[PDB]
Ligand binder design. Structure first.
Ligand SMILES: Nc1nc2c(ncn2[C@@H]2O[C@H](COP(=O)(O)OP(=O)(O)NP(=O)(O)O)[C@@H](O)[C@H]2O)c(=O)[nH]1
Ligand SMILES: [Mg+2]
Length: 166
């Protein structure tokens, strides 16, 4: 069947795993559990199409920046995740976007900019400036909460549709 190779990238602790685990396992992991590299394959139906989501849940640890190239080449679509209460993770987005572009020899890679943790009231990244960023990349901006599940399916399914339109 059609498979979509999705990759979730971003600074440590933004909720990359929490987002993936909500989507695949319908619950919120509220605990400390840094990722090395986890893969999730799940058969779903999206807009009537039987397909396989092949999701790579990556690490934010900057020491492994050199090992990102290999999985970025293979990924068809990318969630670039920051947390709306972590300004540094939003500044870090640019470095992820640029490495993906460099490694993919592409400046129109399927990609969604994801503002996660939108359940938290203590926001430090205004939605408008994240939206301004996504507009300058030419990609959708979606806010999510892995805790409440708000926007989660939206972010992943939009990414799949970005791949279908590429
Ligand atoms: N309130 C709230 N907390 C969240 C949300 N997503 C993740 N968290 C919490 O934030 C922490 C980090 O989440 P995690 O998913 O492990 O982050 P990560 O980006 O995978 N980290 P790593 O890069 O090390 O693998 C955890 O305590 C998690 O429960 C969210 O949407 N809302
Ligand atoms: Mg993780």
């Amino acid at each position: 069947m059609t498979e979509y190779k999705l990759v979730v990238v971003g600074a440590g602790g933004v909720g990359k795993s929490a987002l993936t685990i909500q989507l695949i396992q319908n619950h919120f992991v509220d605990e400390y559990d840094p990722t090395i590299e986890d893969s999730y394959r799940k058969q779903v139906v999206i807009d009537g199409e039987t397909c396989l989501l092949d999701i790579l849940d990556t690490t934010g640890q900057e020491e492994y920046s050199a090992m990102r190239d290999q999985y970025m080449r293979t990924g068809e679509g990318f969630l670039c995740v920051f947390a709306i209460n972590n300004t540094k993770s939003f500044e870090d987005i640019h470095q992820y976007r640029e490495q993906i572009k460099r490694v993919k020899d592409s400046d129109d890679v399927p990609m969604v900019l994801v503002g996660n943790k939108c359940d938290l009231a203590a926001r430090t990244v205004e939605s408008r400036q994240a939206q301004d960023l996504a507009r300058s990349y030419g990609i959708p901006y979606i806010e999510t909460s892995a805790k409440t599940r708000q926007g989660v399916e939206d972010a992943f399914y939009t990414l799949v549709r970005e791949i279908r339109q590429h």
